[PDB]
């Protein structure tokens, strides 16, 4: 067999594109850059933990990290009258009376590597642009979920697949060379236009190469290829501390695999949209399936982004959480053939919602319990997604199955568009608000799931 390994490699290469923002876009601690502070520190011998205390504005009640991240004291540090023990005491009687200003002179990031945030200065006022990086990719997924069918209708299937692979590889390689943010967003959108199209085309091909009597195992293996790709992305991210190097090391393997994938012997081998709603039972099924797809995509992406934004040891937490899918995949494989798909999916959704709810009250120092809860939630959502990827095949007849899959999977992309703004922006108002929303969505999805036959 040759198609199996190469198609699993193709599926594994989709993971760094989808969840790569966790390592390409990490946000280190930062503060306003102020000239003259370096020379004063050299004169006074200030350690980094001492300079970060003397100059950068301190934390207020309940944290309030904004005053240090986006503001600075407008004081002429060049004056020699400043005391080496404490320069702020010679300025004014009260520290709160000193003038305040934005980071006009730049930023200082406490990290040896770099990311898009550290290079394009997507912090404070510009910090809302980081969500746009994922939103553009999800918009590309949404557009490719509808344009790829027409493209493959007007063009040869294998040639269209080859063209999409080539375009994806070229776009991924080109992104690492972007000189500014707008061009990078253009390449991100172009890559997202073809990434999900390639994934679905590979799914269809791998389900065609094996008869309908064994599609489950094939689909589960294709899914676990994504977990293998996540593990490889974690390894590469640990090895390479800069985002351009990681982008090259991610995109290049696909292009080189294209050089080896010229031709293989097994390669060359109307329903109406209104029909889904004219009948009450099918309308109910379509509504429930759309809601479940949206909720599961929101929960999965939100959990990964929250882990990326809040975990204190990102590499090990990502490595642990990624490995839990494989036991989840095996659990799903055992469960489907024995006790059906409805109850297991409902229980997985309930477990995910409960895990989201419990995680709110955990103190920050209990990292060993927080990671266990995160792993449980990830296993729950993984099992739920595995179940829902197979239930759709039964409720829809072959006459309208492909249209139903295309329609239902389109809401996942809208959820992907909405999700970054929920995770990143609502966290400003209250750190527990995204967790509350995720818990509510998970519990509601668990409740509604019982209605499916
Ligand atoms: C009918 O066949 C399909 C297959 C896959 C999907 C999307 S593709 C996607 C895009 C971005 C992030 C994750 C995913 N994964 C992969 C999940 N991993 C555990 C493998 C899904 O399963 C998505 O569906 C969801 C979210 O429920 C839709 C329809």
Numbering used by the authors: 19 to 287, 331 to 514
Verbatim from the authors:
The overall architecture of OCT1 in our cryo-EM structures resembles the classical MFS transmembrane arrangement of pseudo-symmetric 6 + 6 transmembrane helical (TM) bundles corresponding to the N-terminal (TMs 1–6) and C-terminal (TMs 7–12) lobes.
Additionally, anti-arrhythmic drugs such as diltiazem, a calcium channel blocker, exhibiting plasma serum concentrations above the IC50 of OCT1 after administration and could similarly contribute to cardiovascular toxicity. The OCT1-DTZ structure was solved at pH 6.0 as it was necessary to reduce the pH to dissolve diltiazem (due to its lipophilicity and lower pKa of 7.747), but no significant structural changes were observed when OCT1-DTZ was compared to the other structures solved at pH 8.0. In OCT1-DTZ, a pendant ammonium group was close to E386 likely forming an electrostatic interaction. The aromatic groups in OCT1-DTZ were both located near F32, W217, Y361 and I446 which maximized hydrophobic interactions, whereas the additional methoxyphenyl moiety of diltiazem was proximal to W364. Polar interactions between diltiazem and Q241 further stabilize the ligand in the binding site. The hydrophobic pocket of OCT1, with a specific charge coordination through E386, likely favors molecules with a pendant ammonium cation tethered to a large lipophilic or aromatic core. Docking followed by MD simulations of diltiazem (n = 3 × 500 ns replicates) correlated well with the modelling of the cryo-EM map, with an overall RMSD of the ligand of 1.4 ± 0.4 Å calculated across the combined 1500 ns of simulation. On the other hand, the structure of OCT1 in complex with diltiazem (OCT1-DTZ) showed this compound formed electrostatic interactions with E386 through its pendant ammonium cation. In comparison, the smaller localization of a positive charge in the pendant ammonium of OCT1-DTZ generates a stronger interaction with E386 and these compounds are stabilized by additional hydrophobic interactions.
